[PDB]
């Protein structure tokens, strides 16, 4: 009765009249006929076709995910007991030591299998300082060096701890200390913390990406305009900008797996610049407003884009500037998506605390579109402060996925 008119499909309350004589008259008969007459000559008539398709028919007939196994299905190891929230992850090329970085000003390394906090180092004495904190850490892809880059504030710190052994550590240190924004030799405190060299620009190092060559790496400096991206080389302690004029704020930048070009992931676009001539090779127009992280297939044939606005997209460098396919399923911002280095798999991370893993075949030369299908919904992360899986990295050779979250507890997932 409280409902308004025109939302009264049942225009009366059915009653169980025991006898025909008890049936009363109807006073609303005039109203119903009046409404029908008005609708007949006043209701706009629109021609339409009523759908009758099966509701489940819309689901694509993709191959069953269980037939594409193995893929991660459960969490097998947890790096609990962390003082701060693990913002970043870094798996070494050998896939033996997993480095972690948090806002507590301490970088911790956890074994992939045993999970023991073998080694630690402190970057900022003021762990509670809100001005700056550890932004990101990345292991050097080149082997036989064991160099861990640690981005804290403006200071980019290269760390070579005693984990890997004298000879490898000696080679790494010699690689770092070969020079005889600005580069400054480590101080006594930095040397005690195993910091081999310090690099500091004007802006903070919000992101970092290494190159397989083992010498070149790039950093992203938001709120820097022209200097939003800088290219650095360890072999000569030299810094250069990828191009003379960067436009807008930039979130991420990663080198091509083998080509001499650097991908720049602008706030709204992803662009390819050839470092040999510093010329804009191509521009990508993703179907998302604000990209979060950039990812490149190891074969270099397909690109993956992630966006904070609930959007994660698959990009093909040969199909068109627009994404090949747009995926939107997460309940919160997609923090990061990382390709698998060897296996044809990739997974996405979001602030909702749920991780998804997708199988993806990338034809090297066949003129066929890639086949990407979901495999399994991974759960176990705890959503805190509207945040979830801050970072996630796949194993260099196995189908295992490391994870990091705001709950001050990194995790590792295994089949």
């Amino acid at each position: 009765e409280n409902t308004e008119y025109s939302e009264r499909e049942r225009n009366f309350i059915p009653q169980k009249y025991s006898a025909l004589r008890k049936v009363p008259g109807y006073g609303e008969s005039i109203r119903e006929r009046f409404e029908r007459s008005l609708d007949l000559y006043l209701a706009p008539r629109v021609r339409k076709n009523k759908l009758n398709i099966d509701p489940n028919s819309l689901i694509p007939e993709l191959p069953s995910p269980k037939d594409l196994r193995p893929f991660p299905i459960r969490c097998s190891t947890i790096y609990a007991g962390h003082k701060g929230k693990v913002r970043t992850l870094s798996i070494d090329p050998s896939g033996l030591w997993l480095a972690t970085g948090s806002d507590d000003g301490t970088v911790r390394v956890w074994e992939i299998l045993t999970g023991r906090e073998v080694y630690r180092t402190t970057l900022i004495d003021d762990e509670e300082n809100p001005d700056y904190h550890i932004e990101c850490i990345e292991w050097n892809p080149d082997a036989n060096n064991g160099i861990l880059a640690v981005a804290v504030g403006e200071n980019i710190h290269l760390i070579v701890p005693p984990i890997f052994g004298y000879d490898i550590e000696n080679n790494g240190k010699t690689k770092i200390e070969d020079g005889f924004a600005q580069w400054n030799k480590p101080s006594q405190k930095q040397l005690e913390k195993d910091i081999c060299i310090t690099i500091s620009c004007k802006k903070t190092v919000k992101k970092l990406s290494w190159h397989r060559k083992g010498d070149y790496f790039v950093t992203v400096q938001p709120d820097s305009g022209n200097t939003s991206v800088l290219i650095h080389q360890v072999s000569k302690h030299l810094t250069q900008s990828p191009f003379k004029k960067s436009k807008g704020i930039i979130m991420d930048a990663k080198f091509h797996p083998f080509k001499p070009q650097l991908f720049v992931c602008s706030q709204r676009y992803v662009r390819i610049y050839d470092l040999s001539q510093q010329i804009l090779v191509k521009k990508l127009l993703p179907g998302a407003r604000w990209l979060s992280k950039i990812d490149i297939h190891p074969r270099g044939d397909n690109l993956i884009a992630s966006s904070f606005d609930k959007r994660v997209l698959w990009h093909d460098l040969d199909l068109a500037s627009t994404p090949y396919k747009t995926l939107r399923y997460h309940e919160k911002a997609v923090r990061s998506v990382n390709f698998h280095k060897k296996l044809p798999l990739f997974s996405s991370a979001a602030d909702d605390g749920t991780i998804h893993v997708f199988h993806a075949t990338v034809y090297d030369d066949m003129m066929k579109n890639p086949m990407i299908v979901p495999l399994k919904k991974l759960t176990g992360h705890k959503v805190i402060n509207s945040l979830g899986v801050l970072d996630a990295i796949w194993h260099p050779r196995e189908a295992w996925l490391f994870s990091a979250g705001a709950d001050n507890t990194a995790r590792l997932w295994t089949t």
Binding site: E4, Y5, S6, P44, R45, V46, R47, K48, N49, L51
Partner: protein
């Protein structure tokens, strides 16, 4: 889809407002008629 043909009718907007306005107008007209009948008997 093989959707079957049909002819949809769009909502007749302001129907409830028109009904309420007519009810108010009917009540006002009845009151005015009663008042006029009262007044016309004292002339």
């Amino acid at each position: 889809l093989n959707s079957n043909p049909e002819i949809l009718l769009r909502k007749r907007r302001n129907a409830d407002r028109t009904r309420i306005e007519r009810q108010e107008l009917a009540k006002k007209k009845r009151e005015e008629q009663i008042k006029k009948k009262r007044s016309n008997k004292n002339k």
